[PDB]
Scaffold this motif. Structure first.
Motif, PDB file in Angstrom:
ATOM      1  N   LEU A 183       6.433   8.940  -1.341  1.00 46.99           N
ATOM      2  CA  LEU A 183       5.093   8.696  -1.861  1.00 46.99           C
ATOM      3  C   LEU A 183       4.676   9.935  -2.643  1.00 46.99           C
ATOM      4  O   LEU A 183       4.438  10.997  -2.064  1.00 46.99           O
ATOM      5  CB  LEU A 183       4.107   8.450  -0.713  1.00 46.99           C
ATOM      6  CG  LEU A 183       4.489   7.364   0.300  1.00 46.99           C
ATOM      7  CD1 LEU A 183       3.493   7.380   1.447  1.00 46.99           C
ATOM      8  CD2 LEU A 183       4.520   5.995  -0.369  1.00 46.99           C
ATOM      9  N   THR A 184       4.604   9.800  -3.960  1.00 46.00           N
ATOM     10  CA  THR A 184       4.215  10.906  -4.816  1.00 46.00           C
ATOM     11  C   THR A 184       2.909  10.582  -5.530  1.00 46.00           C
ATOM     12  O   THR A 184       2.815   9.582  -6.242  1.00 46.00           O
ATOM     13  CB  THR A 184       5.292  11.187  -5.876  1.00 46.00           C
ATOM     14  OG1 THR A 184       6.493  11.622  -5.229  1.00 46.00           O
ATOM     15  CG2 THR A 184       4.824  12.253  -6.850  1.00 46.00           C
ATOM     16  N   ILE A 185       1.897  11.414  -5.325  1.00 52.44           N
ATOM     17  CA  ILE A 185       0.618  11.214  -5.988  1.00 52.44           C
ATOM     18  C   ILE A 185      -0.065  12.568  -6.143  1.00 52.44           C
ATOM     19  O   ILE A 185      -0.191  13.331  -5.182  1.00 52.44           O
ATOM     20  CB  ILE A 185      -0.282  10.207  -5.213  1.00 52.44           C
ATOM     21  CG1 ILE A 185      -1.631  10.081  -5.917  1.00 52.44           C
ATOM     22  CG2 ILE A 185      -0.464  10.636  -3.775  1.00 52.44           C
ATOM     23  CD1 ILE A 185      -2.489   8.963  -5.376  1.00 52.44           C
ATOM     24  N   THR A 228       3.909  15.219  -2.524  1.00 58.72           N
ATOM     25  CA  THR A 228       4.943  14.221  -2.270  1.00 58.72           C
ATOM     26  C   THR A 228       5.255  14.131  -0.779  1.00 58.72           C
ATOM     27  O   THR A 228       5.422  15.149  -0.105  1.00 58.72           O
ATOM     28  CB  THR A 228       6.249  14.558  -3.017  1.00 58.72           C
ATOM     29  OG1 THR A 228       6.076  14.285  -4.411  1.00 58.72           O
ATOM     30  CG2 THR A 228       7.423  13.738  -2.465  1.00 58.72           C
ATOM     31  N   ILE A 229       5.328  12.909  -0.271  1.00 57.74           N
ATOM     32  CA  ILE A 229       5.647  12.687   1.128  1.00 57.74           C
ATOM     33  C   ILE A 229       6.992  11.982   1.193  1.00 57.74           C
ATOM     34  O   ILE A 229       7.272  11.095   0.381  1.00 57.74           O
ATOM     35  CB  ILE A 229       4.613  11.769   1.821  1.00 57.74           C
ATOM     36  CG1 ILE A 229       3.242  12.444   1.859  1.00 57.74           C
ATOM     37  CG2 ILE A 229       5.083  11.431   3.237  1.00 57.74           C
ATOM     38  CD1 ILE A 229       2.176  11.583   2.504  1.00 57.74           C
ATOM     39  N   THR A 230       7.829  12.379   2.144  1.00 53.36           N
ATOM     40  CA  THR A 230       9.122  11.727   2.310  1.00 53.36           C
ATOM     41  C   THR A 230       9.246  11.261   3.748  1.00 53.36           C
ATOM     42  O   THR A 230       8.544  11.750   4.636  1.00 53.36           O
ATOM     43  CB  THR A 230      10.311  12.672   2.026  1.00 53.36           C
ATOM     44  OG1 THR A 230      10.363  13.685   3.037  1.00 53.36           O
ATOM     45  CG2 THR A 230      10.173  13.316   0.663  1.00 53.36           C
ATOM     46  N   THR A 231      10.130  10.300   3.967  1.00 54.84           N
ATOM     47  CA  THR A 231      10.395   9.781   5.296  1.00 54.84           C
ATOM     48  C   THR A 231      11.728   9.066   5.246  1.00 54.84           C
ATOM     49  O   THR A 231      12.018   8.331   4.294  1.00 54.84           O
ATOM     50  CB  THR A 231       9.314   8.788   5.778  1.00 54.84           C
ATOM     51  OG1 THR A 231       9.734   8.209   7.023  1.00 54.84           O
ATOM     52  CG2 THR A 231       9.094   7.685   4.753  1.00 54.84           C
ATOM     53  N   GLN A 232      12.541   9.291   6.273  1.00 58.15           N
ATOM     54  CA  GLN A 232      13.851   8.672   6.351  1.00 58.15           C
ATOM     55  C   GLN A 232      13.893   7.598   7.421  1.00 58.15           C
ATOM     56  O   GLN A 232      14.950   7.022   7.673  1.00 58.15           O
ATOM     57  CB  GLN A 232      14.920   9.724   6.623  1.00 58.15           C
ATOM     58  CG  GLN A 232      14.981  10.798   5.558  1.00 58.15           C
ATOM     59  CD  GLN A 232      16.295  11.552   5.567  1.00 58.15           C
ATOM     60  OE1 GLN A 232      16.321  12.780   5.686  1.00 58.15           O
ATOM     61  NE2 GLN A 232      17.399  10.818   5.428  1.00 58.15           N
TER      62      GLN A 232
END
Lengths: 245, 39
Positions: A7-9, A13-17
């Motif tokens: 999620l990039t805004i 940026t947020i990441t999750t696996q």
């Protein structure tokens, strides 16, 4: 391809696996207010990237006997970054939100958190226990700010309504053996096109451990829950001096 | 002809709804002054 996500805004940026898809509340994406619904005549200000970005609020600690927590929008951000400033300087405000609740453990821990969004989350009191006292929640409880508050009777959501039916609202579960986060995109919901970010909370976010946390002695016991949120399509109107409440 | 000397700026309109508001930007100039009036 459904468990991994980004999620990039704004400049964040947020990441999750280990995700479990994303929920678009009531199937609608946030959007600026169109000219047919609008009523206020002044040109709005739409700061864009300075306010539509991810903000990370304080972290909570999930214990084997936690009741659950809740936050109110936009209250949580009325005093943070450039968003807060716009909320204070303007009378009118509207926006959507991307809520990302984070919580990871190990393949040996267990527990399930219900993450839901309840619009117009009006709280109630226990009425002095007996029910003869018409008491009311303190400002600190209705609008707990960025720190969020704790539920005293999660079973009735501190409002005389069954938690067992909360799934009728936009929600996700954070079941430790499956995923480590929940993501809900919420559109603006109100009976008016714009409203005061100070006097009215459009919805509340509830994180409640329906299935208690559990693990064997020796395994990490500090299992935190972090809340990161991002305003979307934030608009402001009715400019004047700053007002905190 | 022997004797020569012997020879409303408002209309209704149908306005069923209130006037709309057109979007406007900034105006920076001389000669034109809508804010000034003469009651």
């Amino acid at each position: 391809s459904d468990r991994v996500a980004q999620l990039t805004i704004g400049n964040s940026t947020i990441t999750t696996q280990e995700a479990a898809n994303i929920v678009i509340a009531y199937g609608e994406w946030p959007e600026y207010c169109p000219d047919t619904d609008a009523t206020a005549v002044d040109k709005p200000t739409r700061p864009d990237v300075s306010v539509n970005r991810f903000f990370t609020l304080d972290t909570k600690s999930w214990a084997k006997d936690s009741k659950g927590w809740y936050w109110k929008f936009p209250d949580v951000l009325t005093e943070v970054g450039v968003f807060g400033q716009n909320a204070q300087f303007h009378y009118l405000y509207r926006s959507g939100f991307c809520v990302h609740v984070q919580c990871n453990a190990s393949k040996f821990h267990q527990g399930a958190l219900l993450v839901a969004v309840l619009p117009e989350y009006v709280l109630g009191t226990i009425a002095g226990g007996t029910g003869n006292e018409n008491s009311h929640p303190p400002y600190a409880t209705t609008q707990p700010g960025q720190v969020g508050a704790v539920l005293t009777h999660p079973y009735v959501l501190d409002a005389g309504i069954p938690l067992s039916q909360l799934t009728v609202c936009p929600h996700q579960w954070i079941n430790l053996r499956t995923n480590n986060c929940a993501t809900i995109i919420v559109p603006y919901m109100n009976t008016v096109p714009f409203d005061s970010a100070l006097n009215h909370c459009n919805f509340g976010l509830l994180v409640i451990p329906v299935v208690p946390l559990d693990f064997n002695a020796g395994a990490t016991s500090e299992i935190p829950i972090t809340v990161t949120i991002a305003p979307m399509c934030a608009e402001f109107a009715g400019l004047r001096q700053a007002v905190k409440q | 002809d022997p004797i020569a000397d012997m020879i409303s700026l408002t209309a209704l309109q149908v306005l069923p709804t209130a006037a709309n508001t057109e979007a406007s930007s900034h105006r920076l100039g001389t000669g034109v002054v809508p804010a000034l009036q003469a009651a």
